[PDB]
Amino acid sequence: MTGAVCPGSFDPVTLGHLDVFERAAAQFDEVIVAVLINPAGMFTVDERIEMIRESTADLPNLRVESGQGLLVDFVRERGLNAIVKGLRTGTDFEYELQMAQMNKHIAGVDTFFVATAPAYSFVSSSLAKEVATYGGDVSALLPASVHQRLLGKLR
Amino acid sequence: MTGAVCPGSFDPVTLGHLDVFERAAAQFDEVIVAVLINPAGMFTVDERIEMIRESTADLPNLRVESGQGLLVDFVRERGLNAIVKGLRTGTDFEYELQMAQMNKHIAGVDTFFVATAPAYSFVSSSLAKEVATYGGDVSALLPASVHQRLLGKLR
Amino acid sequence: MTGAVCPGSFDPVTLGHLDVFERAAAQFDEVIVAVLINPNKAGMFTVDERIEMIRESTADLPNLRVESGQGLLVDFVRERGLNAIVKGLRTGTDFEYELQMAQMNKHIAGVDTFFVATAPAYSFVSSSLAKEVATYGGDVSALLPASVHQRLLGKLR
Amino acid sequence: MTGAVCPGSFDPVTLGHLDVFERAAAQFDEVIVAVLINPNKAGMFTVDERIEMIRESTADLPNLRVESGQGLLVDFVRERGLNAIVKGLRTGTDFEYELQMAQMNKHIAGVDTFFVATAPAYSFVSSSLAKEVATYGGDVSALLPASVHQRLLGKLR
Amino acid sequence: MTGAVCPGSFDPVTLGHLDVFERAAAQFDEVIVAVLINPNKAGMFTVDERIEMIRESTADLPNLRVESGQGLLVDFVRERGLNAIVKGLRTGTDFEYELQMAQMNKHIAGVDTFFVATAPAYSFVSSSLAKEVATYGGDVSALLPASVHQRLLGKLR
Amino acid sequence: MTGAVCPGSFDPVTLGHLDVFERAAAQFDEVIVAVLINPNKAGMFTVDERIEMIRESTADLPNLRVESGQGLLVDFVRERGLNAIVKGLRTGTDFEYELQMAQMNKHIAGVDTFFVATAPAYSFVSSSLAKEVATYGGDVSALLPASVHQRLLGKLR
Ligand SMILES: O=C(O)c1cc2cc(F)ccc2[nH]1
Ligand SMILES: O=C(O)c1cc2cc(F)ccc2[nH]1
Ligand SMILES: O=C(O)c1cc2cc(F)ccc2[nH]1
Ligand SMILES: O=C(O)c1cc2cc(F)ccc2[nH]1
Ligand SMILES: O=C(O)c1cc2cc(F)ccc2[nH]1
Ligand SMILES: O=C(O)c1cc2cc(F)ccc2[nH]1
Ligand SMILES: [Mg+2]
Ligand SMILES: [Mg+2]
Ligand SMILES: [Mg+2]
Ligand SMILES: [Mg+2]
Ligand SMILES: [Mg+2]
Ligand SMILES: [Mg+2]
């Protein structure tokens, strides 16, 4: 009965996030995507959850839930003690390293990092929103569903 | 039926390696420690395997095997497609990132990185050997068994 | 024929920026310094002040011109018939964040980015740190062109 | 008579800070801990509370004293007859913004900066992360001096 | 007439190298690929084989030519009337040893270095890792030009 | 009372090293430059040559002395009644490798390590790169003390 939690804001979910979800779902029996409620973003929590659910329909062992507060409490309250996070740079590793060590210290929760697929090395929710705001084409970087929803928030 | 391979030379295995093994064994159903045969080291392959087996007796779902050649072939020939590796720095992440992306490309094998326990952040097989060679006390950094064997190779 | 764009907010321009401008001007037929203006947040200097400070310290570069813009950098570049950006870099961390933006710029518009290592003497000046040091009275006269230093002190007083 | 200044906001002081203070006091005749007063961002503890938490935690360091200050750090250092800063570091990224600042401080005032690696056990603690964890009920008592932990529980009630 | 030199051992040339060559040839009037001859470490391919592999892969770049050389790179560059080097980069660490070399080359000979980010798809390929993977039977054909892959299979037999 | 050890192979000493020596000598009562000799691999310069080059360029530092040693640095430090190492750092990568050794040194012997950022003008000189550039004829006269440069050229000829 293995399992891991994939946390983030996912505003919106990108193909880089989806790649991490698919890799986590292939290596753990149960994956929970943890969508942070952090009350300034573009999509509401419900919209973010729906976009992730739409993009993960081919992953039978993955579910999507929202939460607040300490990630380690979210993880432990579901009987798990592993986090799976995607990583792009060594700079990414250092700040995430501090949080991983803190999370292990306070709750015994482990963090596994997975390297980003090369094709999504430069994709982030924030950069995709910013580029699309000025009319740049990000359709190759986002799930097809997410892309239409993004066009709608801008127009 | 989840599983991961933890590769290295382990010459000798340190408490930093053991920490990674224990974390992998807690999150995957099956863990295989892959001891590289790379024919200049201090211990023979058989001695390295025995030291790891001695230090992992409390991990029922972990076994230790030797191998050569492409790590991805070792992994795939055992029905698995995940590697678990310990990481200390962002510099660690960058060279290991290149190998992880190559391994995914050529064999579909994924790599999960886990941050080192803070207490073992500075321990490496090479630095422990070098310090012990000049008489420094590394007993707090190595499994109790390994420590005696190391004293024997030097004296 | 060849050309590159050197972008930044240049609020104000530093000697590190000027070094980059001079290196780009020596290697490309034309260089455009693109002064980024945020229509929502004013900097310390207005657009005309930023441009004046750059022009005064680049008068010896005949193939360099200065223009302002906003929004997507790759549109500024392509509308001028060019497809190269030149940017200065001080460290490995600068390289990772700038890396993301360079790969996005090539993906969305085919525009290439060339990075050049700062001259050592200017490794540590940034517009933001020069402003913060000067705000609390530190001497930054050797890090800014003559066209900048006293205008900066006047803004602060 | 040698000496160094250890600057920070210390809101609150952590065991990582204390480890740096102890190592500085062991190697310099005089150490001054400089507590930054920022008239903008007012943190969780007042400057007086922060000074008292540091004094309790450093009671066994006779050559270390605690003072508050404002503005340019190198002015604080030189006003006390010193020309050295001692700061703790955790990562290579830490070394990057801090290296820019150290070179700037050497350039503008001739003040030197010595960096020391955090003890491994305290490498993941920071004032900000400790407060955030404690706000949501996590146990950070192994990462803070005993008296800080008591005061921090009070501020959260 | 602008120009730049693209140096390396290219043993063998990869698609990451080729991407850099194409971007340099698009932005400079003349590009010289400089193939290093090292009388000590003799790699897998002779210098002539390496030049021919590059020429096959760059047949559509008319302003790019391939030459071999030895010793100090900045002497090779200045002997050809140029003063710019173009190199591809992958990581922040890459930027570190390469930044030291670029500053040294600027200091000793006035030669500038422009760095370009690898295309994402080729960011994990290197000559050395490709050879190692191919030696043990891994498939690196998507990472090398077609003619390189054929020659590399031959050397392994 | 206070003191620090500045270790290295100094084969040969550079102006970056001398900058570190001067900064340590201004902040500690005594400084010992510890010249590391590998009894198994000779460097370019013998131990007496390395020491002579350092002494000639540190004659204005009355509280600095030069001694050779081998093996564990922490034994050299402790046998002299000291427990501080001072080392220069150029980049974030330098900080990670040196980090490992500083934490091991504190673990096995209680010896602290203080790092100081190189002066910008010497950010890019290393003994190894100066030797390699000089080997192929490049001009490194401005990166080495007078006590070194012509002795280096003589070794190479
Ligand atoms: O990044 C975090 O701190 C975080 C993300 C998150 C998601 C949840 F669903 C609950 C708590 C969280 N904390
Ligand atoms: O690091 C490697 O390349 C490697 C380690 C290893 C261990 C094995 F058992 C087999 C192949 C390997 N390759
Ligand atoms: O950094 C940018 O995104 C940017 C800089 C810039 C300068 C211009 F003139 C126009 C658009 C820009 N965008
Ligand atoms: O980091 C700073 O800018 C800073 C810290 C500090 C502390 C003092 F007590 C006085 C000035 C300061 N400046
Ligand atoms: O990297 C170098 O040192 C180097 C590469 C190279 C290529 C040439 F053709 C000539 C000299 C070189 N030096
Ligand atoms: O870098 C070292 O390990 C080292 C430097 C050194 C210098 C001495 F004089 C003695 C031992 C040393 N060890
Ligand atoms: Mg993102
Ligand atoms: Mg190791
Ligand atoms: Mg700037
Ligand atoms: Mg802190
Ligand atoms: Mg290569
Ligand atoms: Mg050196």
Numbering used by the authors:
A (entry chain C), B (entry chain C): 1 to 39, 42 to 157
C (entry chain A), D (entry chain B), E (entry chain B), F (entry chain A): 1 to 157
Please quote the paper that reports this structure:
In this study, we explore M. abscessus phosphopantetheine adenylyl transferase (PPAT), an enzyme involved in the biosynthesis of Coenzyme A, as a target for the development of new antibiotics. Phosphopantetheine adenylyltransferase (PPAT or CoaD) catalyses the penultimate step in the biosynthesis of CoA in prokaryotes. The enzyme catalyses the reversible transfer of an adenylyl group from ATP to 4′-phosphopantetheine (PhP) to yield 3′-dephospho-CoA (dpCoA) and pyrophosphate. Further studies on M. tuberculosis show the essential role played by the coaD gene in mycobacterial growth in vitro, confirming the potential of PPAT as an antibiotic target.
Screening of a fragment library of 960 molecules by differential scanning fluorimetry and hit validation using X-ray crystallography resulted in the identification of 16 fragment hits. These fragment hits occupy four distinct sub-pockets in Mab PPAT, spanning the entire active site groove of the enzyme thus providing several potential starting points for drug discovery. Although the corresponding prazole fragment 1 occupies sub-pocket I on Mab PPAT, the indole fragment 5 preferentially binds sub-pocket III, as do the indole fragments 7 and 12 on Mab PPAT. Fragment interactions at sub-pockets III and IV coincide with the binding mode of Mab PPAT in complex with PhP. Therefore, crucial contacts at this part of the active site, such as those mediated by Leu72-73, Leu36, Pro7, Ser9 and Glu132, were recapitulated by these fragments. Sub-pocket III is seen in an occluded state in apo, and native ligand bound Mab PPAT structures. Whereas fragment binding results in an open conformation allowing further chemical exploration of this cryptic site.
